[PDB]
Design a protein around this ligand. Structure first.
Ligand SMILES: [Cl-]
Ligand SMILES: [Cl-]
Length: 221
């Protein structure tokens, strides 16, 4: 299913429409949008397309929470249209059911694309908690798309299946307990993340220990 000769994308829209809320000195609530992002992820290759959503897009309308699902689908279709046919996904998987109808309507010109929902817990949006992504999104002054490889150099020595499993444990651990996940991921004073990598450089033994610890963190909360 997931890693065969078939391009698959996971699409995550949770962090597209984001706001900060503040109680003013007068006792009222101000709600100000902040920049968001769509995560579009290929589990076989590790490719992430990060579409930064700048707050200027929101200016007109109410129910921005609903509108964001539509905006997400619009941007997925725009990405597909910008790619040669051979690079277009065969399947698009969303773990948020709210994305199903908007995607169906936006992708009517792509009859080969299958859209399905998922009950999986795949918090790709947790990438915001990694400083590289967080600052990038925060500081953007306009929409843009940025490419990343979320598996770093792992595929040189492990399968796509193994790499995906490691990534999901990392994201889920960051989602549930950010502070503790970051400690687990830095087992030594000398632990570094290369400038061009997302995740730390760890030995195989260190990864084994990390993977068990992240799993236990996820079970604990
Ligand atoms: Cl939803
Ligand atoms: Cl989770």
């Amino acid at each position: 299913e997931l890693f065969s000769n078939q391009i698959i994308w996971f699409v995550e829209d949770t962090n597209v429409y984001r706001v900060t809320i503040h109680k003013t000195f007068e006792g009222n609530l101000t709600t100000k949008p902040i920049n968001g992002a769509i995560f579009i992820f290929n589990p076989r290759t590790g490719q992430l397309f990060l579409k930064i959503i700048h707050t200027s897009v929101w200016a007109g309308q109410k129910r921005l929470g609903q509108l964001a699902k539509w905006k997400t689908a619009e941007e997925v279709a725009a990405l597909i249209r910008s790619l040669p046919v051979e690079e277009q996904p065969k399947q698009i998987i969303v773990t948020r059911k709210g994305m199903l109808d908007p995607l169906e309507v936006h992708l009517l010109d792509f009859p080969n694309i299958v859209i399905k929902g998922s009950e999986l817990q795949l918090p790709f949006q947790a990438c915001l908690k990694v400083e590289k992504f967080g600052d990038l999104i925060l500081k953007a002054t306009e929409p843009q798309m940025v490419l990343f490889n979320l598996y770093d150099d792992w595929l040189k020595t492990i399968s796509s299946y193994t790499a995906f499993s490691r990534l999901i444990l990392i994201l889920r651990a960051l989602h549930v307990n950010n502070d503790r996940a970051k400690v687990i991921l830095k087992p030594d004073k000398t632990t570094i993340t290369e400038p061009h990598h997302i995740w730390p450089t760890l030995t195989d033994e260190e990864w084994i220990k990390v993977e068990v610890q992240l799993k236990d963190l996820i079970l604990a909360d």
